[PDB]
Write a protein that binds this ligand. Sequence first.
Ligand SMILES: CC(C)C[C@H](NC(=O)[C@@H](O)[C@H](N)Cc1ccccc1)C(=O)O
Ligand SMILES: CC(C)C[C@H](NC(=O)[C@@H](O)[C@H](N)Cc1ccccc1)C(=O)O
Ligand SMILES: [Zn+2]
Ligand SMILES: [Zn+2]
Lengths: 605, 605
Amino acid sequence: ATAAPQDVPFEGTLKIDVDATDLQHRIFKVKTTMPATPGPMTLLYPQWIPGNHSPTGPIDKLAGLVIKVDGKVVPWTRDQFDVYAFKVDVPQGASELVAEFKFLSPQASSQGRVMMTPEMLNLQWNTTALYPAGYFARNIKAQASVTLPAGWSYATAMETERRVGDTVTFKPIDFDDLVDSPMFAGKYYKRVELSAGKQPVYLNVFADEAKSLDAKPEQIKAHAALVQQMDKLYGARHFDHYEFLLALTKKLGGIGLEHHRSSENSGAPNYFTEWDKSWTGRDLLAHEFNHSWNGKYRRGADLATPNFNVPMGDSLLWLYEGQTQFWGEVMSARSGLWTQEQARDMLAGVAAQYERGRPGMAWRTVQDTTNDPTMSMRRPKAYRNYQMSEDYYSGGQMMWLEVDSKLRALTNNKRSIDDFGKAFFGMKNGDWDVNPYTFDDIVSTLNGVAAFDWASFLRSRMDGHGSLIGGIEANGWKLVYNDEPNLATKTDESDDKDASLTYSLGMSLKASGDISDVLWDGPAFNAGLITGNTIVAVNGRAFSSDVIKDAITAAKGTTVPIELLVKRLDRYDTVRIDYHGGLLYPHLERIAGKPDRLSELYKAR
Amino acid sequence: ATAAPQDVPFEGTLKIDVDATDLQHRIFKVKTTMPATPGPMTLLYPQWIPGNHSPTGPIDKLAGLVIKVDGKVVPWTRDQFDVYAFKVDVPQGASELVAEFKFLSPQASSQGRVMMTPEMLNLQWNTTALYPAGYFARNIKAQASVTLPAGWSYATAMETERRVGDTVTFKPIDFDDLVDSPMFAGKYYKRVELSAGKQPVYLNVFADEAKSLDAKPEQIKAHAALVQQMDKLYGARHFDHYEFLLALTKKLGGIGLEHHRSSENSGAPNYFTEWDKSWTGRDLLAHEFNHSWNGKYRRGADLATPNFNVPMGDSLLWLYEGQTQFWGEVMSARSGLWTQEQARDMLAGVAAQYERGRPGMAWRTVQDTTNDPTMSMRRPKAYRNYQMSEDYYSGGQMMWLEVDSKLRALTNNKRSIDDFGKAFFGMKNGDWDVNPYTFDDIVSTLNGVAAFDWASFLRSRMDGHGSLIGGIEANGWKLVYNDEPNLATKTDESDDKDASLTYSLGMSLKASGDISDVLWDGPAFNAGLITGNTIVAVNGRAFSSDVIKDAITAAKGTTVPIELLVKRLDRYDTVRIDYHGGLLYPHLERIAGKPDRLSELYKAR
Ligand SMILES: CC(C)C[C@H](NC(=O)[C@@H](O)[C@H](N)Cc1ccccc1)C(=O)O
Ligand SMILES: CC(C)C[C@H](NC(=O)[C@@H](O)[C@H](N)Cc1ccccc1)C(=O)O
Ligand SMILES: [Zn+2]
Ligand SMILES: [Zn+2]
């Protein structure tokens, strides 16, 4: 076992030098230099990574580790009860320890998200760092450098000291901020100012091909409007400057990861060039940006750990991620990243997910899903709808919508969730240290906006099994289903011609006919169907998405079952599904006579 | 978080009832009943599973959990710092707790190994169990039952009380032995006696199709000879009876998992029907059977944990798995499961793997690979040859071969590793409780066979970076390479037309030309190639395994480089490989002047 980290000074500087030039093998070469204290010394590879809420440190990708003290090799021994901890014996009279190793980043998605391509790379300093055990991470002064592919541009919130040729030397920085200061680099780069002033915000775009960088003025303006709308909500910025990192790519592994003064984001090459086709993911930058307030600056006390190698407590992720999921979609509408119609159909899809798409809510609480990061590490699960899957995101969002609606009702619409945002995250402009909070702090700040038993309200939703969608009705709308496609579903289905049929047949299909998801206790489930089975034919006709949708519509209101020819492994059988509700996709409709608070919430300030 | 398990009596019986009939959804339905006193109670889902040496308990597949005390639901709360631990409050006057849940076994291999098919199933009791925290697992008396698909046969070492219809009630058993008593069930079943007597051994075969069960007399005899050869080695059996469980299948997930009185094994449907083609995997039953002595009965003290929810120490896996890997191959030859020529070429491949196929030994020791189970959980890695990958298996095997050769050299061939086997595992016939050992015990028993500094010998090999293949030459043979295919490689290549070129071009390829492996610092590596790249053409000719092999031979002894057309993502380039050694496959050849101890080692006793 590794001794607990202590809030004591670390003498000297942890030097971290990274060679990021072996794009072909996708290898980051690392040298870490630090003072050596005589006696046993334990070095740690970061395990629990802020923003991942789970022990995602890729320990088995650390290879070629050789440790030398004052130029002599010393053998290392891994702690079999802490496989992220390497112990060496430092001789008496020693001065300096050097550890050299390689981070073997994924050569295919099966190994994790790809971090190197022929045109760009993603350096996450936790993957290229060893640091001494026994210290709070913030007490370790670090100084990093990286050697880039020839002539590549780079971007990071971390301040550059100098670039000599292709070796970038950064100014000293605390080790926790180093891990929190990722770098993108690439040959096709555009830097766009989103906000000038004393706390400026920039957008750093890297692409597989330069043509993807052609952001149009109104599209840049929508990102600039995001910054303005966050200013209206919070009244403060928790950074001295902010660097959006955005990779437009089909080669780099997808990412959305927040930091204090930056975020790592990926989109498709058509993020800008096909604005109307790429909209469903455009809440990404709003989401990760919001975390600078909600998650990085303010963090649950059980989540704000002293180093990267003690476990994180995720109990409050329904605020961290849940309210950020909420604000990401709201701010997308307020900024023009989304249209109001797009944002409303997205919210309808969230509401339907918890009204009808989450039968696991009968036995599992949203609170318990804050354990999903460590339980599952986002590995494949058979029934996201019944096992549940990180619903502290979207279920949390629905609770925060209801919180907004209740604040309005208590105050005759003079207060809203905007007032909680300013009160809870708006203090101490410019500070980007960690300001921890507890559950009781959430309650007290809500009670300060409008007096109410908020503790019971939050517990009843997060520890309950009942409806989470009450914020829809209270804010003047109603969740409905009809045969009109949901804007998000339609965009997500089309071009590949897939078929999302969650609320009719209780399954989703690829264009090939392969079932990609099955709703627990739904019609497909009750025919014994599982993901991976194939719908070969519908009423005798070779499967297509149009064919099965037409058959569903033809069965609406009749008593003639839909006949599905199914391939299960190497067997074929025909099932008859007595489903006659037609195609059903969620939308929101106004409740006439009630105030439309929802549109006010989603309106630009 | 969770209180430590104590060696104190457990009052009552843990009843575990499993319904294994939902083959379509692949769901095991579970009811666990246990004594309960009022107040706080913590229930555990097994986490660290004996024989996996890592926390493989599938916690995220436990769904639908409802806990009732005296018929009334009690809410449960998971420990966010121990996600395998469930906490409830037991009301006053209660005597009994009932927990019901479902184990959602993998619906595809991406979720883990498949455990249900239309013809067979594999029940592992740890996946269908909750048990009270605070107790040594061996102190908990359990009693299990299972409801099978209609008419299915079953086999397990656990003794049956009665079968009523399709519900099997088992006799009470200690909870640790329950977890150690898996069950196979299926519609195509054959039971074969391998040894009669007071400690009988049976082979239980389940198949996708009945024709695969047609074991011929000489093939059954080889399995009977395996039991006889183990008797000669150890002189004792650590079980009152033993049940081989063997699944001949393309649908059940592959498995080799040892137990005290049974093992879980899978083979191809042609395990018997194409005996000469399916030979490379036939050390499986010899391997897992050997674990009844080495691993189950004798186990490292740091591995022999008190329950399933504290971490296991794997430091001695180079004995547990390493010597079992050794005996699995030796016993295949001694029993006739393998021919002597097959076993020799298999050993040649192991020797070559550490002579030339493990460049990672320059920085990592075999000892450190005992941490790979927890580090990697057998997830994909880019360079098994450089990161290393559980080399305590085959590297351990090579060390034990050298131990054998050294015992012979010290004793003028009067003692061998067979004497260590009998001395270390041959005590206490009939005993199948765990008999722990430490490193010092290994040393003392070796020293008792022949006096020598065995501690330094073992450490020099397991903590070193040098050669592990010294036992080959010491026992009278020499590792050589030539263009004659290795029998194991040829069989593993055949039918699919793959190309293993580790010792020539430093890579392996599928018939498609996709690179499946790259040797660190080898020729393919030095051309920048990675797994997933595709060799499109060789000297301009469309790739095939024969085409690239012919080109390698054509380049032998010349100065004309091999031209490879390569697809890297969406780009094509041609590389010139200056490799002129020809095809090189490992074999063993006699050193004519030296005594042939290797053949003695592999000879039937
Ligand atoms: C591309 C998007 C879907 C990315 C999105 N990212 C986020 O929500 C971030 O704010 C999360 N902090 C990223 C995260 C959370 C838990 C475990 C691993 C990674 C996510 O769901 O991971
Ligand atoms: C089919 C064969 C390859 C199976 C073989 N099984 C064994 O060696 C058993 O003795 C191991 N005890 C199985 C094992 C070890 C570590 C982690 C998971 C599972 C294995 O390598 O897993
Ligand atoms: Zn987030
Ligand atoms: Zn084994």
